[PDB]
Structure formats: structure tokens, C-alpha cells
């Protein structure tokens, strides 16, 4: 809750983490919020009493967030101009680039596409720190615009006006628009899961998984059990413990691993614009 | 599909009954149990 209680909580674990190492407290290193590792609904639940009562902290209990990503569909190419000739530090930076989407899981790639050198040598690092920068806050919501290849294939400059910095903008302008133009697309996190389950409960097991935006990959049996592998979205994945152990009266266990990122079904496009 | 103004046959197992000046329509799936009104 208000930063006030942020403290009562600190001590909360500072003593509760000695009095029970069967959990783990983690501050999401990308976005404040802290995760509370538990070992079952009830578990986290009963901590919610003690930690909220015998410690009288009264905070929030919703769910983890999802590491989205931004990017684009169609490749574009725009002008990146900047120039400000008034009288001196002219501030003069201007480039044109080549933006092209890359396969979901391609990475980050620039292209020093300049002929003889209409774009000076010494100014590129900064033209990139510019582009690289701007990829931070997505065009859609604000998240790491990824999976693209950038090509610097022109750009002039000024003898006295340009600056290392002036390019960092120009370049951070050409990028701040290529993305806006090439129709953004909300990528999202997919996981790898494997429920260990007696093909008894299976039946619904897979169903359940299907009606979770997820799509199966297989089930090569084991012992009296049978394993099921497949991908799912972290959003439509929550609180799976007391969902699996449900459809299995307890004889059910799973794992989870990250894998790739992937576009949202448009229905989920305008959903996220909230 | 209980009460309505357009009662029809929602699957082969359904039957258009009419006990009591009231056209009922019954089937094996208690969902199709209708009745005009």
C-alpha cells in the first residue's frame, strides 16, 4: 500500500524468512513489485493472515505482471531530421534508416550502410545509443520494442553544426517513428509446461489447457503416469497449482519454463490498451 | 430454452408436446425443455 507499509513488510520477512525458509521473496528486478514464493494456495494464504495481522501490514494481493514486448509487422523507412540553424551550435543531425521486422526471437541489429561517409565516423556510436535508447519505451504501452534490424543507409551532416549528441536525437527520432509507422504489435511471454498426471485426469487436463490460450505438444507416458508438454501465456496461466491439483485431487504436478514471445490475437490488442 | 414466443425443434430427439393448451417441447437434454409463452 502507501510507502508507509512498505516498511512493516520489510521486517515482516526479515523475521518470517528465518522462521520459515520454505518461501522466497523477490523484488521483480524490472518493475518494483515483489513476488511472494509459496508452496500452495493455503500456504501463501496463511501468510497473508499472519503477515497482515500479526504484523498489521495491510497491502495488496493481486497477481504478477507479464513481461510484454513491442515490435512491428511491416518494414518502414523514414527521415530522421533535426537541424536547428540559428547561429552557432547549429545542432544538425539527419539520417534515414531501414527498419525491417525480424522473426520472433531475432534480437537487435543495426546496419552501418553508409557509402564514402556522408555520415561522419565519430557520430555513429551516438546515433546508435540514440536508436538503442528509444527502443526502451514501446510505441504501444512502453515496453522493450524488440525483434528488429535497423539499417542506417544515409544521412548528411554539418561541418560546424553537428554534434555527437545531435545525432543521438536524429537517430532516436528515426526510430521513434519507424515503429509507430510499421504498425506495432504486442508480443508476449510463452511458457513450457509439463504436468505429471495419471491419464486418469488427463481428459480434462488437456481441455483445461486448451481453454487457456494454450496449444499442446505431446504426451509420452511415464510409469503409471503420463507427461504433457505444451506452451501457454503467463496471463492465462495463473494460480495453476490450485487448478491442476483440482482436476487431479492432488495427484498432479507441473513445471514451467520460459520459451519465446509471440503476438497477441488482436482481441488481446485492444484489451491491453487500457 | 424454457419460456418463449418461438418454440421449435432443437435436435431430433425433441418432441412437440401440447399438453394443456400449452405447446411444450421436450427432449433428452433438459436444456431443450421448452414451452410457448
Amino acid at each position: 500500500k502507501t510507502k508507509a507499509d512498505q516498511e512493516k513488510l520489510s521486517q515482516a520477512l526479515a523475521r518470517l524468512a528465518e522462521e520459515d525458509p520454505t518461501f522466497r521473496v523477490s523484488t521483480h528486478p524490472e518493475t518494483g513489485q515483489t513476488i511472494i514464493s509459496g508452496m500452495g494456495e493455503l500456504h501463501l494464504e496463511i501468510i497473508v493472515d499472519r503477515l497482515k495481522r500479526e504484523f498489521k501490514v495491510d497491502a495488496n494481493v493481486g497477481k504478477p505482471q507479464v513481461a510484454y514486448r513491442e515490435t512491428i509487422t511491416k518494414p518502414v523507412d523514414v527521415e530522421g531530421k533535426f537541424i536547428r540553424q540559428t547561429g552557432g551550435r547549429g545542432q544538425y543531425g539527419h539520417v534515414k534508416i531501414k527498419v525491417e521486422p525480424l522473426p520472433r526471437g531475432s534480437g537487435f541489429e543495426f546496419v552501418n550502410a553508409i557509402v564514402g561517409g556522408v555520415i561522419p565516423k565519430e557520430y555513429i556510436p551516438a546515433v546508435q545509443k540514440g536508436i538503442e535508447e528509444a527502443m526502451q519505451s514501446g510505441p504501444l504501452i512502453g515496453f522493450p520494442v524488440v525483434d528488429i534490424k535497423v539499417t542506417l543507409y544515409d544521412g548528411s551532416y554539418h561541418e560546424v553544426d553537428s554534434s555527437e549528441m545531435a545525432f543521438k536525437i536524429a537517430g532516436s527520432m528515426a526510430i521513434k517513428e519507424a515503429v509507430q509507422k510499421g504498425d506495432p504489435v504486442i508480443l508476449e511471454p510463452i511458457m513450457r509446461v509439463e504436468v505429471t498426471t495419471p491419464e486418469e485426469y488427463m481428459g480434462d487436463v488437456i481441455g483445461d489447457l486448451n481453454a487457456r490460450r494454450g496449444q499442446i505438444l505431446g504426451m509420452e507416458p511415464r510409469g503409471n503416469a503420463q507427461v504433457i508438454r505444451a506452451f501457454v501465456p503467463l496471463a492465462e496461466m495463473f494460480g495453476y497449482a490450485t487448478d491442476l491439483r483440482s482436476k487431479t485431487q492432488g495427484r498432479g504436478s507441473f513445471v514451467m519454463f520460459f520459451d519465446h514471445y509471440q503476438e497477441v490475437p488482436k482481441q488481446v490488442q485492444e484489451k491491453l490498451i487500457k | 430454452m424454457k419460456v418463449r414466443a418461438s418454440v421449435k425443434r432443437i435436435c431430433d430427439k425433441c418432441k412437440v408436446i401440447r399438453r394443456h393448451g400449452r405447446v411444450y417441447v421436450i427432449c433428452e437434454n433438459p436444456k431443450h425443455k421448452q414451452r410457448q409463452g
Binding site: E199, E220, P221, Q226 | -
Partner: protein, 139 residues
Amino acid sequence: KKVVAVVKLQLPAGKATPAPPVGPALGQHGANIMEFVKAFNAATANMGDAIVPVEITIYADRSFTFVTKTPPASYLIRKAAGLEKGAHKPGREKVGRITWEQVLEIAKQKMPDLNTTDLEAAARMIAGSARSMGVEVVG
């Protein structure tokens, strides 16, 4: 001490590992799950691939048994046309073919399984399986 059987598995050629459906269903068999990848791949060392149906039957003394049929009628027919897949849409699209004789040669391959005891009939079951995968019969 499990119950009895006329198990109707369907194991391909070669892949004979105790792993299911050869474990759950031959877990009430006592089935020497390894006296197959030798007694099988011995007879079907000939063929190579193609699935081979099998009926492993258990008893009470906890022993097994099993007889195997022929490889799919659709098998011999893919290799006899440079085919692999059917033709996605049978009929309109021919991708390869078999003559009046090549079909009458395969009915020979699977004649001790079907039902009729000719070829004028047997062959028809293959010429039928022709358009089942869009493989017109040459004549």
C-alpha cells in the same frame, strides 16, 4: 496377476521399446516386450518400415501371444508412384500412378488378409485405394 486380453495394438516397424502403449496395456500381459524387436524386425527386416498391426493375447499363466497382418494398403501405394503423401485432395489431382499390373501385383501382397480369393476383386480394393489418395490407376 492382472486380467486377460486380446490386445489390439498397432506398432510400426522397428520401434519396439517397452514405452507405451506397450507398457500400460502389456503391463497386464507379462509380455516379453523385447522378444518382438527381434522376432519382428526379423520378418520385417525385409520390408523396412510400414506399420504392422499386431494382436498380442494374454492368459492367466501370465504368457503372451501375437499375430501380425500386413502393411497398410496405402503403403505399397506411395512408394509405387514416387509418393509419400496422398494428394491432399484425392481425385482432381494426380501426383503419380499405378498401372493395371502394378495394382494387380499389390493385391498379391495383401491377398491373404482381405476377404475375396481372386484378384478381379482383390485388385479393386487397391484400385479403390487409388482415389483414396489421388493416385489414378494407369491402364
